[PDB]
């Protein structure tokens, strides 16, 4: 019981690709990457500030051999099309002066460092909206008492980072179909 559900009432597939969109349309678009600081390529995960964009398709993978993902299960999140310079497509939380930050890595990482997320359903809602928790899984064990929220930087980048109660909410929109063109 209690599996993750997508924007269309359907169960989220394990290993499937989704667009991670905001609950409130007006808050931006989907998830993508940016090149920041001394970075050799786009390794910081940020929310697109443009509402039309669905961002990059994201693979949601859990620790179990199950077709679907139950709430309470730790997940690894990774871009279906990672920046070539990232060792693996998986997101990870790296410390820094400003606080813990979500991002890709240049070196292929261990499972305990990528299986660090967990979705928590939003209370007051007609559809399935979730908050993203970061689970302290480093000092041998795991406690999810931190959230992933946004932090706008100097260049205007809405970077995903751990915060003190400024949780972002997500709606998981299944990926696979469409796009357009000009003339």
Curated annotation (Swiss-Prot):
Note the site residues: Reactive bond for chymotrypsin: 65-66
Q: Which UniProt keywords apply?
A: Disulfide bond, Protease inhibitor, Serine protease inhibitor, Signal
Q: What single Pfam family name could you report for this chain, choosing any that match?
A: Kunitz_legume
Q: Does the keyword Signal apply?
A: yes
A single GO molecular-function term is: serine-type endopeptidase inhibitor activity
The set of disulfide-linked cysteines is 41-85, 135-144
Q: Which family does it belong to?
A: Belongs to the protease inhibitor I3 (leguminous Kunitz-type inhibitor) family.
Q: What does this protein do?
A: Inhibits alpha-chymotrypsin at the molar ratio of 1:2 in state of 1:1.
Protein name, as recorded: Chymotrypsin inhibitor 3
Per the UniProt record, the source organism is Psophocarpus tetragonolobus (Winged bean)
């Amino acid at each position: 019981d209690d599996d993750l559900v997508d924007a269309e009432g359907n169960l989220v597939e394990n290993g499937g690709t989704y667009y991670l969109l905001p609950h409130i349309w007006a808050h931006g678009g989907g998830i993508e990457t940016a090149k920041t600081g001394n970075e050799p390529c786009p390794l910081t995960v940020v929310r697109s500030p443009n509402e039309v964009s669905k961002g990059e398709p994201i693979r949601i993978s859990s620790q179990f051999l199950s077709l679907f993902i139950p709430r309470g299960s730790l997940v690894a999140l990774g871009f279906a099309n990672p920046p070539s310079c990232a060792a693996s497509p998986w997101w990870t939380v790296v410390d820094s002066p400003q606080g813990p930050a979500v991002k890709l890595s240049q070196q292929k990482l261990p499972e305990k460092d990528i299986l660090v997320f967990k979705f928590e359903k939003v209370s007051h809602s007609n559809i399935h909206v979730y908050k993203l928790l970061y689970c302290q899984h480093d000092e041998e064990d795991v406690k999810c008492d931190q959230y992933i929220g946004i932090h706008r930087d100097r260049n205007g980048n809405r970077r995903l980072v751990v915060t003190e109660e400024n949780p972002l909410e997500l709606v998981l929109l299944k990926a696979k179909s469409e796009t357009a063109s000009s003339h």
